[PDB]
């Protein structure tokens, strides 16, 4: 997160400290080219394209 610049950080059923501190069985990291212009459609409880 320090390497990049934070623009949006939204989570469901979990807190930022929970994901950043809790130990997990195996973390899955997905990255993609997502512009900030369509932030209304990148959400867990969203119906965007």
């Amino acid at each position: 997160l320090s390497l990049f610049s934070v623009n949006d950080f939204t989570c469901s059923q979990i807190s930022p400290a929970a994901i950043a501190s809790n130990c997990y069985s195996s973390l899955i990291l997905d990255y993609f080219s997502y512009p900030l212009s369509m932030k209304s459609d990148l959400s867990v409880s969203s119906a965007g394209p």
């Binding site: 979990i14 807190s15 400290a17 929970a18 501190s21 809790n22 130990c23």
Partner: protein
């Protein structure tokens, strides 16, 4: 039952009874269902380190 629900003491002569009242003693009233606790744990701020 033992680890969350009901425990006896090893340090004493504890004896155990299981009984049933078929019909006669109407003085006792029956419950709706049997409820027994299976999980009881304290969740710290450590976020699922339980």
């Amino acid at each position: 039952i033992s680890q969350f629900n009901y425990k006896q003491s090893f340090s004493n002569p504890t004896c155990l009874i299981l009984a049933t009242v078929p019909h006669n003693l109407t003085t006792i009233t029956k419950p709706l269902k049997y409820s027994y606790i299976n999980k009881c744990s304290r969740l710290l701020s450590d976020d699922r380190t339980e």
